[PDB]
Each structure stands twice: as structure tokens, then as C-alpha cells.
Design a protein around this ligand. Structure first.
Ligand SMILES: [Cl-]
Ligand SMILES: [Cl-]
Ligand SMILES: [Cl-]
Ligand code: NA
Length: 281
């Protein structure tokens, strides 16, 4: 079973756990990121070393006169159910926030997951890319209105109405799930916190059939974002199988985007979450 597997991984000061994590290090990394490296796109990446692969990047519709107008730092990611179950992205920049909302619109996104604060330890990690109040705003040609904001202990849930300017009756409801307690150092203090957050989000995702991919982001869109997605996938497997494959999930993530589950600590945390679920049952 899982508990015995994890016991063996943790034996000898996590020796086999480390070895397994290190086996994933080169996965996916021979893939080109030439589009992301075009000079015209340079300002559109938050981090030089976190770029989407050409094979898996999300494309925006082209705006005439600008061939590089298709670019956003964003990647498609598989889950248990669909090949493009998620779109992962960086925390938007002031200059990419209209692109972000354009992607949300064009990809039929109904659910957005944000696993960061805008500022952490005095560093800007993500722009405040959504409305501050209930007054509506255009991001490019898209109209956005916050209908509700619910500040809970460990997350904030917001509802937005989005529509194109030239068709006001064809609007969409979008939910935004903002995990607000990820600590400045390490991983969350409890497994309970991220497990409950993931299950909360999943229960909303299951009630949005016909939606496009779920957007997940943090600052770079790799570590916390990858941990969120891996956890979502493995908790579904547990509920269904119950046959958990944490290694396989992280491997598949790495094929789609660099650094997904970016630290060994996050990889350990995934194993702890699953153990804790099983212990509670
Ligand atoms: Cl290049
Ligand atoms: Cl699939
Ligand atoms: Cl798909
Ligand atoms: Na692609």
C-alpha cells in the first residue's frame, strides 16, 4: 500500500524519496522555447528561466499587424480526465493582464486558481489583475465585473461576470479561488489546508461541466501551481482507485512545463497529504 511505500521512501533520511525526485530532473527539458525567446515577447515573461515549451504553450488569437500577438506565458497541462485539463501560467504583469483575460475568454475558462499573494516578503509576485470593487472594467475588449468576494480563513473566493463588449448578453460566470496562506518559507504548515483547498476547488470544477481548462497560477506558475495540480490529480485517484501515482503525475507535468513541483519539499508534501488522507480513513 501507499503508507508502506512512503515509509520506505522516508527511510535513511528520505534517501529513496530524494533519488526518485532526482530521476525527474531532466524530464521534458530538451524541448524548445523559441517562441517565448523571441525579442518581441521578452517583456511578456516574468522570469527569464520560466518559459513555456513551444509544443504545449497556450496561443492567443492573432491581432493583425502583430505576429507575436499570439504569445502568453502559459502551458496546457493534462489531468486524469482531459489532455488539456489545466492551463498554467505566471502571475500576470501589468502589461500582460489584458492577454490573461483574453486567454480566459478564448479558452472558455470558468475557474481560476491563484496560489500566491501579490506581494510576499516585500517582493511583487503577481499583479492585482482583477477589479478592486464591484464597478465594471474593460481589460482590452472584455468587460469584467466582480459580483462577490468572500474572505475565508485560508482562501478568498471571488465571482466575476465576463463578456465581450460587442455582445453583452453572452456573458459568463467565473470563479476565482485565491489561496492566501502559503507561507513565505517552505510548504503549508498543515496538509489539511491544501487538501481542503484542492477539494473545495475540485467540487466547483465538477459542477462546471463543458468548461474549458482550469487556470492555475502562482508567481512563476511552476512550484505551488504544480503542487496544486499534482494534489488535485492524486486525490481524485485516491477517491476512485484508490491507486495513487505521485511520480507519474509529476513526470507528466514536467513534460508540459518546466519545474512543475519545483522543490523536493513540495514532493514530500504531496506524499504527506496522501498519507494523512489515508490515516484519516
Ligand atoms: Cl531562440
Ligand atoms: Cl486523459
Ligand atoms: Cl482536452
Ligand atoms: Na500548443
Amino acid at each position: 500500500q501507499f503508507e508502506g511505500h512512503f515509509m520506505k521512501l522516508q527511510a535513511d533520511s528520505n534517501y529513496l524519496l530524494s533519488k526518485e525526485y532526482e530521476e525527474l530532473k531532466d524530464v521534458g527539458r530538451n524541448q524548445s522555447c523559441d517562441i517565448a525567446l523571441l525579442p518581441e515577447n521578452r517583456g511578456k515573461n516574468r522570469y527569464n528561466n520560466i518559459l513555456p515549451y513551444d509544443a504545449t504553450r497556450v496561443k492567443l488569437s492573432n491581432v493583425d499587424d502583430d505576429p507575436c500577438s499570439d504569445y502568453i506565458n502559459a502551458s496546457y497541462i493534462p489531468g486524469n480526465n482531459f489532455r488539456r485539463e489545466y492551463i498554467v501560467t505566471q502571475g500576470p504583469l501589468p502589461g500582460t493582464k489584458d492577454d490573461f483575460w483574453k486567454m480566459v475568454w478564448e479558452q472558455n475558462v470558468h475557474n481560476i486558481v491563484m496560489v500566491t499573494q501579490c506581494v510576499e516578503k516585500g517582493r511583487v509576485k503577481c499583479d492585482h489583475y482583477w477589479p478592486a470593487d464591484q464597478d465594471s472594467l474593460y481589460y482590452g475588449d472584455l468587460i469584467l465585473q466582480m459580483l462577490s468576494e468572500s474572505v475565508l480563513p485560508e482562501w478568498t473566493i471571488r465571482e466575476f461576470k465576463i463578456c465581450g463588449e460587442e455582445q453583452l448578453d453572452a456573458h459568463r460566470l467565473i470563479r476565482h479561488f485565491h489561496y492566501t496562506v502559503w507561507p513565505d518559507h517552505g510548504v503549508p504548515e498543515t496538509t489539511q489546508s491544501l487538501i481542503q483547498f484542492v477539494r473545495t476547488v475540485r467540487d466547483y470544477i465538477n459542477r462546471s461541466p463543458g468548461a474549458g481548462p482550469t487556470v492555475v497560477h502562482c508567481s512563476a506558475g511552476v512550484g505551488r501551481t504544480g503542487t496544486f495540480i499534482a494534489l488535485d490529480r492524486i486525490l481524485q485517484q485516491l477517491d476512485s482507485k484508490d491507486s495513487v501515482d505521485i511520480y507519474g503525475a509529476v513526470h507528466d507535468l514536467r513534460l508540459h512545463r518546466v519545474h512543475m513541483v519545483q522543490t523536493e519539499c513540495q514532493y514530500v508534501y504531496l506524499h504527506q497529504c496522501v498519507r494523512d488522507v489515508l490515516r484519516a480513513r
